[PDB]
Structure formats: C-alpha cells, structure tokens
Design a protein around this nucleic acid. Structure first.
Ligand SMILES: [Ca+2]
Ligand SMILES: [Ca+2]
Length: 341
DNA sequence: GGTTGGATGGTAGC
DNA sequence: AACGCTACCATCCAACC
C-alpha cells in the first residue's frame, strides 16, 4: 500500500501572512495570550524566520521577546485557521475518498486505488502542492511512503515547501539508522528515557525485553515502536474518533472564591458544548490548574447523558469539592467532557 | 482476570 | 525559570461481575 501525508507549513503563521502579505520575510510568532499581564502567554507556533533564533511553540512569550523584540507577535485566531484548514481538507478529498484528519494542519490520504507506484505518487503530490498553492496561497510539505508513520517522517525531512518519497528499501535503512527521537509521537522526554535504556534507533527496540521497554514508556508507545521496527506497522487511514472534549481558561487573578470562579467555569462549559456539536457525554471532569501549575481533577460519570444545564449544576458541585479537598489557589479552571454515546 | 470509575501523575505537539 | 492550551496515555486503588 501507498500513503500520502500533507502537512501545512508553519500553518498559523502562514494564514496570518495570507491575511496580511506585508509579513512576507518577517519573523511571525503566533501567540496564546492569557490576559494576566501585557505579553503573558505561550507561543503556539512561529514561522521559519523566527525559529531560526529559538522562537518555537511551547516557550513563554517573554523568552521570545528577549530573543526577537522586533518580531511581529500576533494573537491566535483558531477559528480562522480552522476555516482555512477545512477548505484545504475539502481539496484533499478530490484526490482520495480515504482520508484521515490527524490535526488542524495534517492529513493522510490512502492513495492505493489512485496510483500504482511511487513515481505517480510523487506526481500526484506535486498536483496537491500546486492545487493548494492555487486556491489558498498555502505551501505544504508532502511525504509519501508505505505507511502513515514513514510518510510523516518523509515530510519532516523535506520541511518547508518540500516533497519526498521513502521507498521500501529506505524504510529498511531508516529502521536501522534514523534517530529514534525523529519518530512521530516520540517527544524529547521519551527520547531521553529511550537513550537511557540504550535505544538510539528503531531497530534497538528488538534487543531489549518487551517488559523493560513497556515499564519505561508505556505499553502503547512500546508496541508502536516494536511494530515499526519489524516493518509490520499498517494502521488504516480512518476518521479519528475524539474521546473527550473541553475547555480550560486562565483566570484574570488566582482565586478560591466560588462566585469569582463560577463565571469562568460557566464560560468554559459553554464553549465546550458548542464544540461537542450533537455528541452527548455521560461524564464531566472539572479541571482546576493551581497556583503552581499542578492539576486537581474532580469528576462524575452519570447513568444517563449530560445536558448543558446539568453540566452547570454539576460543575459547581465538583468545583466546591476541589476547594474543600485542596487549599491551593486556582489559576486556570475548566471542564472536560467524555464517554460519548 | 477484565472492566468501569475516579484520582494522581504525566506526555506530544500546534 | 518565565509559561498556554487540547487531548491523549499511565498507574493505583476500590468496587464490581
Ligand atoms: Ca504539523
Ligand atoms: Ca479511590
């Protein structure tokens, strides 16, 4: 089988530039502002001219303004990027019925009944690149391989505005020689734990006993890496079913005052319910993030489904419970629905 | 032995 | 260290079939 993975480059930053072409060539840093102070928050994503100097998703905004004070710092407009993403995903469906929306900027297309060999895949890849450039003025990277994972690695090597096939013999080679930290799903925490066990390449996961690997990185990532290592991985391309939905917001000031927090929790429940869109949850968890960024969850599963109005009533009960059983001040508050019918 | 449930701890990645 | 946010996984213990 053949798989084609499209990744939209520095996506949030690219859309900001489509909407204001005077950003071409400038360092653009899309940010999530908390409302605490001037410029308090975290970088959601930055374009290649900002990443050049260390300004990446995750780091605090104040770190970034120390590195690039004259960079354009924009607030995040998820609703806008979502719309753009959805219009690009629609173009992608013209090339394949079998598609998987992995995220707001990532999709996999199974193209096994659309092309015979990797030559054609490349050509269709340029046809997807040109098409998205044509309609939305967005560059993307295309990666083609025999499975979802090596198609995503192909895009990673060819990043910005690239395209790259990985044929069967280079899969064999990469199981042997690819830094294992560049395997999708393997962050820096997991890369350091693996490096402590002496696993630097995918093939090294077959020397260590399975239980010693599972005991370190969980059964899920264990089976995943051993599978890629055998060259046996072959998960189908499918609609990702979301298991939970919710919002948590940052409060203006830290607090332990039910009536001061109520409005935020209620605001988060509203937004969560619109995101649910016809899905009926049976479970609610209130998540309070404390003064020191630790987390305090209280929850309930119901015999029956949860209405918006029941969620308000039940979230106050659960929040009251956090205030009784834990006396730290709360900084962020919100809600997490799950167990959909 | 497996599952549902809730609390605590933790992770990848835009 | 600073610091936002969605959603996912992992471990323990309790209660249960
Ligand atoms: Ca991406
Ligand atoms: Ca318990």
């Amino acid at each position: 089988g053949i798989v084609l993975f499209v990744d939209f480059d520095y996506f949030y930053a690219q859309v900001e530039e489509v909407l204001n072409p005077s950003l071409k060539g400038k360092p653009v840093v899309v940010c999530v502002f908390s409302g605490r102070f001037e410029d308090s928050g975290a970088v959601a994503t930055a374009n290649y001219e900002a990443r050049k100097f260390g300004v990446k998703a995750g780091i605090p905004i104040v770190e970034a303004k120390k590195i690039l004070p004259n960079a354009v710092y924009l607030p995040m407009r998820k609703e806008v990027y979502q719309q753009v993403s959805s219009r690009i995903m629609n173009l992608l469906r013209e090339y394949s019925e079998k598609i998987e929306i992995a995220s707001i900027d990532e999709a996999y297309l199974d193209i096994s009944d659309k092309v015979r060999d990797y030559r054609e895949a490349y050509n269709l890849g340029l046809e997807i690149k040109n098409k998205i450039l044509e309609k939305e003025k967005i560059t993307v990277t295309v990666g083609i391989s025999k499975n979802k994972v090596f198609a995503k690695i192909a895009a990673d090597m060819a990043k910005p505005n690239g395209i790259k096939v990985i044929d069967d013999e280079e899969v064999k080679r990469l199981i042997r020689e690819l830094d294992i930290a560049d395997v999708p799903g393997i962050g820096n925490i997991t890369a350091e734990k693996l490096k402590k066990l002496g696993i630097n390449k995918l093939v090294d996961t077959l020397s260590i006993e399975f239980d010693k690997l599972k005991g370190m990185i969980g059964e899920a990532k264990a089976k995943y890496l051993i599978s890629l290592a055998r060259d046996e991985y072959n998960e189908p391309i499918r609609t990702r079913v979301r298991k939970s939905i919710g919002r948590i917001v940052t409060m203006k000031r830290n607090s332990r005052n039910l009536e001061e927090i109520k409005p935020y929790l209620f605001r988060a429940i509203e937004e969560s319910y619109y995101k649910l869109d016809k899905r009926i949850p049976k479970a609610i968890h209130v998540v309070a993030v404390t003064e020191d960024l630790d987390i305090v969850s209280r929850g309930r599963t119901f015999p029956h489904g949860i209405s918006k109005e029941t969620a308000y009533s039940e979230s106050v009960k659960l929040l009251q419970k956090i205030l009784e059983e834990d006396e730290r001040k709360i900084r962020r508050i919100g809600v997490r629905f799950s167990k959909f019918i």
